């Protein structure tokens, strides 16, 4: 039908092959919500969404 499937990429990559199409590579980059540059109520947010 007309569906949608979540997945989970890593640091090293993820490829998925939809049918007869060519495989497409996807990498993720460290985009934690915050900033590692001050106000210590907030440094422990950026270093928690990566490596909790």
């Amino acid at each position: 039908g007309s569906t949608s499937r979540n997945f989970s990429v890593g640091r090293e990559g993820l490829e998925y092959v939809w049918g007869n199409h060519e495989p497409v590579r996807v990498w993720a980059q460290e985009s934690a919500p915050g900033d590692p540059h001050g106000w210590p109520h907030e440094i422990i947010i950026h270093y928690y969404h990566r490596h909790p």
Binding site: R11, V17, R25, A28, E30, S31, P36, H37, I43, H46
Partner: protein, 438 residues
């Protein structure tokens, strides 16, 4: 001379480095793998496919008795009967009543269409690796391919490259593996001679045009129950077809590390693991002595902005003052920072702009021009988009991955927790010694 360097094993992304001799100008050196094939050692056991149950014509002796002989064809089967009385389209084909004995017979061989969709079964031992390099030094590009074992010289146009042995030793191919029609499944087939009625390895032969076919397919016969002539046989279902229905996924969507499986030499080409410790023998013709390369008199780095990510996010600026209008090799001497441009034309005075890509929030790396060093230092922001379509160029390494203000706000706390107790202990022993005069 020869310069040792461990290039990482990721296909496509180059690993820049520069070499240094005394009295000679420095020379850049770009190393990149472009395609790497992984080929194992192949031992073939047999070939199986769908069978074809042949029944030769029923031998009938009128007014006598029979008993079999021995043969060697696959699943040879004898069962004489007693007191038969057959019937053709002309009724009463035989004459002598109540003791006619017929001889049934059954055996098997391959299907006629077995040449296309047979399933070769193999055995794999201790694969070896072959990488395709691409070396660019001093505007002289050299193509070559070499073996990865540390004694095999891959030579190409006066440039001897001895790739040493890789660290990790594995393959996606386990010990037993079948192959049909290009699709590489992965399966623990029965060893040769050991049939099973109703599973893979049901009918085995060392070649498809052979005559030493062996089989054990559980053919039990029946006594003929209707007046006409036939041969009532029953046989178990084919192990190849019922294996094919329950085959599972092939190796092309289960093999780790991104390996693409080519089938015709059974290779596992173009995937990424470990490091490749190589060494490049630079020829002595690409070296001009240091009196002729224009030396730079002072440099001072200053960066502009960062986005530490996969792509070339950070921008760089050196401000120099040089001697003449020649060239300069450019290399950053870190392991978390890599530069886009490798050489730049120089002026007696002028500026420059470079590009780097890093993964740490502080850019405290060292950038070398022709001869001198100048430390760059600023802080760098995380990226905005969560997913990018190209892989990272340097690693994470978890020492400089933590920020500077995080260390300056935690190491003060740990240093205070140590300082309060060492002050408490020294004033304890001082007070006890000062009262201890009595």
């Amino acid at each position: 001379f020869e310069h040792a360097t461990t290039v990482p094993n990721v296909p496509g992304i180059p690993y820049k480095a520069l070499v240094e001799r005394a009295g000679y100008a420095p020379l850049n050196l770009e190393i990149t793998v472009v395609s790497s094939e992984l080929t194992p050692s192949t031992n073939k056991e047999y070939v199986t496919c769908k069978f074809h149950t042949v029944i030769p014509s029923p031998q009938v002796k009128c007014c006598g008795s029979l008993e079999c002989k021995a043969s060697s064809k696959a699943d040879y089967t004898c069962r004489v009967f007693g007191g038969v009385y057959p019937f053709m389209w002309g009724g009463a084909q035989c004459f002598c009543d109540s003791e006619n004995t017929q001889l049934s017979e059954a055996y098997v061989e391959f299907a006629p269409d077995c040449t296309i969709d047979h399933a070769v079964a193999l055995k794999v031992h201790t694969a070896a690796l072959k990488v395709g390099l691409r070396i660019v030094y001093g505007n002289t590009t050299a193509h070559l391919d070499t073996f990865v074992n540390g004694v095999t010289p891959g030579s190409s146009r006066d440039l001897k490259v001895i790739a040493g042995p890789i660290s990790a030793a594995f393959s996606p191919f386990d010990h037993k593996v079948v192959i049909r029609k290009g699709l590489v499944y992965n399966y623990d087939f029965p060893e040769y001679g050991a049939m099973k009625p109703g599973a893979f390895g049901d009918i085995q032969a060392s070649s498809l045009d052979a005559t030493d076919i062996v089989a054990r397919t559980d053919i039990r016969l029946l006594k003929p129950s209707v007046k006409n002539i036939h041969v009532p046989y029953t046989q178990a279902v084919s192990g190849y077809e019922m294996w094919k229905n329950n085959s599972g996924r092939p190796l092309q969507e289960t093999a780790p590390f991104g390996c693409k499986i080519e089938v015709e030499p059974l290779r596992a080409s173009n995937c990424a693991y470990g490091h490749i410790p190589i060494s490049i023998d630079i020829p002595d013709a690409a070296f001009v002595r240091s009196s002729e390369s224009p030396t730079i008199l002072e440099v001072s780095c200053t960066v502009a902005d960062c986005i530490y990510s996969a792509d070339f996010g950070g921008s760089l600026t050196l401000q120099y003052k040089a001697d003449r209008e020649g060239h300069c090799p450019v290399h950053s001497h870190s392991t978390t920072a890599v530069l886009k441009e490798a050489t730049t034309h120089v002026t007696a005075v002028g500026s420059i702009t470079l590009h780097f890509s890093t993964s740490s929030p502080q850019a405290n790396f060292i950038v070398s021009l022709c001869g001198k060093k100048s430390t760059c230092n600023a802080e760098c922001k995380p990226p905005a988009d969560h997913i990018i379509g190209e892989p990272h160029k340097v690693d994470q390494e978890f020492q400089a991955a933590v920020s500077k203000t995080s260390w300056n706000w935690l190491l003060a706390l740990f240093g205070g927790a140590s300082s309060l107790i060492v002050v408490g202990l020294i004033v304890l022993v001082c007070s006890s010694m000062l009262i201890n005069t009595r």
